[PDB]
UniProtKB/TrEMBL annotation, chain A:
It is found in: Secreted. This is Cellulosome anchoring protein cohesin region. It comes from Acetivibrio thermocellus (strain ATCC 27405 / DSM 1237 / JCM 9322 / NBRC 103400 / NCIMB 10682 / NRRL B-4536 / VPI 7372). The chain holds residues 32 to 194 of 631 of the full protein.
Length: 163, 303
């Protein structure tokens, strides 16, 4: 059981966009999440992975392949601080009792794709990181089941340094 | 067989108590006269007055029945003599001969304070024939245990989400339980317990309304009160669903939207609203929202 951030490319020139994909693996009865992601904003700029449009405080990352049935009322929230190199976003079904009744949990999939535009070819790290607003998180990640309870006991797989 | 009984009463210091003096086995011939003396403890009781009982049929009862209270002597003298002169006001039935009205004194010792027939002359019928009579002493049980008229309606309530000991007292306390159409209510304590005392008997049934800021109102109908009534236990409490934040008796998107306005606020920060911190862990975040979601789309009827 895990949540992972992984990059499609680990090398690039100023102006390239590295695509960081946030993925969950074998997360039982998964119904929602919140994650906190930090990067160095002098080296990388969070952007839309397809358009290069820069993230603001309210930008929710595109590209998830889970929690996509509008029947269960997905609600997405973003509260980034790009100036300070912070992404913080969350999404969950609201009608979890209806999702549960269906009995098919979406336990693996993509939850976000995030582009990071290279501002400097300087060695740099992007990582899930704990933050004051998420007490009890697992390295800045909180995953929730269709009972509305916190899920525990999964690995947080951080990406290697971007050299 | 003719019996004179001092009754019993129960009071707290400061209470006014009534101690009946009963006659049983009154002869067919009736009782025309009687005299006796009661002793009491004037440390415990201040005699206020002795009311002639229902058995005293003289239209001017004082003409047939009088008492003399002597606190310094610790004695009450009872004298009865049917005043009509023809037997007309003779006692002819069993019942209350007199009522001792007494105030239990403000700092009186507790315990049973005996009221005893300490001297007995005779009861005599209309023909002046003495009737052989049994004496039974009584008194007042002075304790400090409160007595409430009416009944106790009580129970346990529990919010439906996960929390630990650091916050259990906060989330369990503060549910108001109201008896609808009365001014009677209780508020749950830190254990989720409530009790409303002095509830009038009602076998037709009360409706209870359980309410708290951010919770979906719960209505419990047909609560029959023929005695002390427990509506739930600590092991099987009345569950309450949080998430009615914009109060419309429905958990919907406007409720979630209100939590989002404080998203990621932490205790002590500008945008922190304690009520929106559902689980009271000091942060407003997706975990709180997911608790709201537990009962999404629910209305009070769904309980
Ligand atoms: Ca509402
Ligand atoms: Ca919280
Ligand atoms: Cl229940």
């Amino acid at each position: 059981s895990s949540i992972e951030l992984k990059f499609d490319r680990n090398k690039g020139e100023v102006g390239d966009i590295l695509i960081g994909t946030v993925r969950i693996n074998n997360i039982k009865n998964f119904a929602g999440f919140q994650v906190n992601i930090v990067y160095d904003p002098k080296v990388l700029m969070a952007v839309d992975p397809e358009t290069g449009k820069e993230f603001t405080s309210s930008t929710f990352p595109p590209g998830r392949t889970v929690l996509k049935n509008n029947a269960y009322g997905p609600i997405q929230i973003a509260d980034n601080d790009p100036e300070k190199g912070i992404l913080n976003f969350a999404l969950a079904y609201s009608y979890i009792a209806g999702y549960k009744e269906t009995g098919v949990a979406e336990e693996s999939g993509i939850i976000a794709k995030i582009g990071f535009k290279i501002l400097q070819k300087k060695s740099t790290a992007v990582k899930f990181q704990d933050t004051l607003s998420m007490p009890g998180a697992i390295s800045g990640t909180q995953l929730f089941d269709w009972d509305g309870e916190v899920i525990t006991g999964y690995e947080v797989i951080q990406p290697d340094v971007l050299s | 067989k003719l019996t004179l009984k001092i009754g019993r009463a129960e009071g707290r210091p400061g209470d006014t108590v009534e101690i009946p003096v009963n006659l049983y086995g009154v002869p067919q011939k009736g009782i025309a006269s009687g005299d006796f003396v009661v002793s009491y403890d004037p440390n415990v009781l201040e005699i206020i007055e002795i009311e002639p009982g229902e058995l005293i049929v003289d239209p001017n009862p004082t003409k047939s029945f009088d008492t003399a209270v002597y606190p310094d002597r610790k004695m009450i003298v009872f004298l009865f003599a049917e005043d009509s002169g023809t037997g007309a006001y003779a006692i002819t039935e069993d019942g209350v001969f007199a009522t001792i009205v007494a105030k239990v004194k403000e700092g009186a010792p507790e315990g049973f304070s005996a009221i005893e027939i300490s001297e007995f002359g005779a009861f005599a019928d209309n023909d002046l024939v003495e009737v052989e009579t049994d004496l039974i002493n009584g008194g007042v049980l002075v304790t400090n245990k409160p007595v409430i008229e009416g009944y106790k309606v009580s129970g346990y309530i529990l919010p439906d989400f996960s929390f630990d000991a650091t916050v259990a007292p906060l989330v369990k306390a503060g549910f108001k339980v109201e008896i609808v159409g009365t001014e009677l209510y209780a508020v749950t304590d830190a254990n989720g317990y409530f009790e409303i005392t002095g509830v009038p008997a009602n076998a037709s049934g009360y409706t209870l309304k359980i309410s708290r800021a951010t919770y979906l109102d719960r209505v419990i109908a047909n609560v029959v009160v023929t005695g002390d009534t427990s509506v739930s236990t600590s092991q099987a409490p009345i569950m309450m669903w949080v998430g009615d934040i914009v109060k419309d008796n429905s958990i919907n998107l406007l409720d979630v939207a209100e939590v989002i306005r404080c998203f990621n606020a932490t205790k002590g920060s500008a945008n922190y609203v304690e009520e929106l911190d559902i689980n009271r862990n000091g942060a407003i975040n997706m975990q709180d929202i997911m608790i709201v979601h537990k009962h999404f789309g629910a209305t009070s009827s769904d309980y």
